Amino acid sequence: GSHSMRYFYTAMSRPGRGEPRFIAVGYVDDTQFVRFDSDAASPRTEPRAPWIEQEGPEYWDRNTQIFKTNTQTYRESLRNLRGYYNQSEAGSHIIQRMYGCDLGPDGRLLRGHDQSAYDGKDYIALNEDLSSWTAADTAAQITQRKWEAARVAEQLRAYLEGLCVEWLRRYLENGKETLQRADPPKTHVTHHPVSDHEATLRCWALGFYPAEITLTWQRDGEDQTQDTELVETRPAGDRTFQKWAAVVVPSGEEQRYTCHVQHEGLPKPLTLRWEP
């Protein structure tokens, strides 16, 4: 199937409580595989998935050098952004960055990404052409000019189309037993009376991987979008995910309702009903 790799960086200032914390995490699809935390007793890149443990000491040293240097770069960046927005030295601020590559079912590059936010607001992003930037405001225009001067976009494009794709393909092969295994949802429909004349029908999906799933309720074959209560997909902690969708139905009308489940691990999409 389709796969992606992403690195997620968070740098957070904390005036009066030491220097800003820098944390980086790396993911292949919904599986985290590495972390670096500048607050750790001994900051080092650490494995977070069993299939990355086979990487050599050169890999871990290379990651750690990059992340240790980024801790410093991001502390300078937080000082710079505070200046660009004329902010006081008193408040806590956050820079987030996410970048990586997407591959399609043939393993070919679909597109690259690089996006940054300041205090949870879009700040600067590399355009889909991997050659130009979109700056949100006059502060981000300063960053845009610096990055043009250092020829950042050219270096980032070469990484996104090269190393990023090559390492993602290596991880997908090393981790094929889990990363390329889609686990279908285990499903069931529960019934809970709400009153003498209404009841809740809840459609469950448990134990699935990846997180992407479609769970909907239909009444006489028509989608019940506005009347469906749909919980955010949640992690079970064993790599798998969980989700439910619920509808409040008039008593005696339960068989007019069907729950539809679409997921990559299923041999066929499911049509479920309440089974008393």
């Binding site: 690195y7 960053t143 990055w147 950042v152």
Partner: peptide, 9 residues
């Protein structure tokens, strides 16, 4: 593997 080029904002 992460991107190795350092560039401050």
């Amino acid at each position: 593997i992460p991107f190795a080029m350092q560039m401050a904002y």
